[PDB]
C-alpha cells in the first residue's frame, strides 16, 4: 500500500498558525502604545 502523506495540508495549517501569531503580536503592540 502507498504510505499516507498529509504533509501538504499540514504545511497549510502551520502557515495559517504563523500568520495568526503575527496578528496577535501586532494587536498587543497597538495596545502597548495606548
Amino acid at each position: 500500500l502507498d504510505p499516507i502523506d498529509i504533509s501538504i495540508v499540514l504545511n497549510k495549517i502551520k502557515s495559517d498558525l504563523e500568520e495568526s501569531k503575527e496578528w496577535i503580536r501586532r494587536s498587543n503592540q497597538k495596545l502597548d502604545s495606548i
Binding site: L1, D2, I6, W23, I24, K30, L31, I34
Partner: protein, 48 residues
C-alpha cells in the same frame, strides 16, 4: 487624544479579528487532514 486611544483600540481589535480568522483557516485545514486519514483508512486499510 480620546479619538486616538479609541482609534488604537479599534485597530487592536481589527488585528485580533484577523488572528481569529487565521485560526479559522487552520481549523478548516485540520478538517481536511482528519478526513484524509479517514479516507485512506477506508480505501487502503479496510479493503486490504
Amino acid at each position: 487624544q480620546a479619538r486616538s486611544d479609541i482609534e488604537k483600540l479599534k485597530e487592536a481589535i481589527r488585528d485580533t479579528n484577523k488572528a481569529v480568522q487565521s485560526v479559522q483557516s487552520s481549523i478548516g485545514n485540520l478538517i481536511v487532514a482528519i478526513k484524509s486519514v479517514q479516507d485512506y483508512v477506508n480505501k487502503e486499510i479496510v479493503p486490504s
